[PDB]
């Protein structure tokens, strides 16, 4: 079928789940706690084993009271409502969700391959075909998300897991939002912020296309296009309208990046009349077989070492903390729909 036809069917499936979300599909007592995989202001992600199946999953745990203090109630409700409704090869699968007196739980597909971030920092950088393979997956994922009126808002290597086949899975939907018009929230990661966010303007899906430019640059250079010791110095660089490329970047890559890292919204690729096709049809993607990528028929440039379904050697170690459940319900009204 045509891309328009495929996206229409994808919208029909998404809307049915978006309008009637799955709720309370498991319980904490159904999982065995193994190890902490990651932490942040959002809470933590724990490797767990579902006893009834023996399957391993990545359990994202948020403390309701802490979410409230961080003013992330609406953003957390967005995350879960969107995750339970989407279906795309390069999006992490939300297997179950539930809450208790203290916490919110999102049980996700576990990717033992770990974060792109770890591999990128260790290796140093990815060659252009390696970076292109990952970039093609993001282009397709954003075409899918944007067609559903979803804005992603936190693209970065920290948020991209590598599966057992070397393909990537977008995981973090903490700032994702379903919005038809413009939006105004100051959110994201300093290095990845589009100028219109820094400048407190109403912005749209074009911020994700700018973030794609930052990701491609970081993957291919080994460092981001705008970096400094403090966020303020990063913002000054972003808004300056200037970008420098490593001498090893191909002419095609520099041209694509100048069109993505474009301060002018009337000129930013992804944001023109031709939409995503300006990106897909760029010289840098001439060797990309978009269908073969979607169908996962392309041989991956890198396969993470497989050491078991529950091995954590591709993850850093974190201090292990108790999962406390109060005897009293906290923030019941705020998270009623979760």
């Amino acid at each position: 079928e045509s891309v328009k036809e495929f996206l229409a069917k994808a919208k029909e499936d998404f809307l049915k789940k978006w309008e009637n979300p799955a709720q309370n599909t498991a319980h904490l007592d159904q999982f065995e706690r193994i190890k902490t995989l990651g932490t942040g202001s959002y809470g933590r992600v724990m490797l767990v084993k579902h006893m009834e199946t023996g399957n391993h999953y990545a359990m994202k745990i948020l403390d309701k009271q802490k979410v409230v203090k961080l003013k992330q109630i609406e953003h957390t409700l967005n995350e879960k409502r969107i995750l339970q409704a989407v279906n795309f090869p390069f999006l992490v699968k939300l297997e179950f969700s539930f809450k208790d007196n203290s916490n919110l739980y999102m049980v996700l597909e576990y990717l033992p391959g770990g974060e792109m971030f770890s591999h990128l920092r260790r290796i140093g950088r990815f060659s252009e075909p390696h970076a292109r393979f990952y970039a093609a997956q993001i282009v397709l994922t954003f075409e899918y998300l944007h067609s559903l009126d979803l804005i992603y808002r936190d693209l970065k290597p920290e948020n991209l897991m590598i599966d057992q086949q070397g393909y990537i899975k977008v995981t973090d939907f903490g700032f994702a939002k379903r919005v038809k018009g413009r939006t105004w929230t100051l959110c994201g990661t300093p290095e990845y912020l589009a100028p219109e966010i820094i400048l407190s303007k109403g912005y749209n899906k074009a911020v994700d296309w700018w973030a794609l430019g930052v990701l491609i640059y970081e993957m291919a250079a080994g460092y981001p296009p705008f970096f400094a010791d403090q966020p303020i110095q990063i913002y000054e660089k972003i808004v300056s309208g200037k970008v420098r490329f490593p001498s090893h970047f191909s002419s095609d890559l520099k041209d694509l990046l100048r069109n993505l890292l474009q301060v002018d919204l009337t000129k930013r690729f992804g944001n023109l009349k031709n939409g995503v096709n300006d990106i897909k049809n760029h010289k840098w993607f001439a060797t990309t077989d978009w269908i073969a990528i979607y169908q996962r028929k392309v041989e991956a440039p890198f396969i993470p070492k497989f050491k078991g379904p529950g091995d954590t050697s591709n993850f850093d170690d974190y201090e292990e903390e108790e999962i406390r459940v109060s005897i009293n319900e906290k923030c019941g009204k705020e998270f009623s729909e979760f």
């Binding site: 202001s41 920290e158 700032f175």
Partner: peptide, 20 residues
């Protein structure tokens, strides 16, 4: 080099989302 400057910077580890 730009690489040396990045490696010596305080932002080579996992980067946190912003808060207001």
């Amino acid at each position: 080099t730009t690489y040396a400057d990045f490696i010596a910077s305080g932002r080579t580890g996992r980067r946190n989302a912003i808060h207001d």
